[PDB]
């Protein structure tokens, strides 16, 4: 997904799926959406992809494979130190909090 999203910079990467795998490579197919197309911008169900926050979801780990490797498949006691992020969690519980009165 990252390779395709970097190659097609003006598109938005929604899901991908395994299509094939041989000895040397694994092959995936990536669905991309043109955010500046009138059909896309008109249809509400995908209209959320046209907002500037959705750039490079493949680069930020927002796609399904990203959510997978970030530990976000599970929730509860099997994704303890996962949300809202591993580094956000680490910061939040390694923070030294100095209240006004202690």
């Amino acid at each position: 997904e990252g390779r395709v999203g970097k190659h097609c910079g003006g598109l938005r990467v929604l899901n991908s799926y395994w299509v094939n795998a041989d000895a040397i490579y694994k092959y995936f197919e990536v669905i991309l959406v043109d955010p500046m197309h009138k059909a896309i911008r008109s249809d509400p169900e995908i209209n959320w992809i046209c907002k500037p926050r959705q750039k490079h979801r493949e680069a930020r780990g927002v796609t399904s494979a990203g959510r997978k490797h970030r530990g976000l498949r599970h929730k509860g006691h099997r994704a303890t130190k996962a949300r809202p992020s591993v580094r956000a969690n680490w910061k939040r519980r390694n923070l030294v909090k100095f209240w006004r009165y202690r």
């Binding site: 910061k91 390694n94 923070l95 030294v96 909090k97 100095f98 209240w99 006004r100």
Partner: peptide
């Protein structure tokens, strides 16, 4: 940078 958060904004 530190790992300190001071809550001076409480008031």
């Amino acid at each position: 940078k530190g790992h300190v958060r001071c809550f001076f904004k409480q008031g």
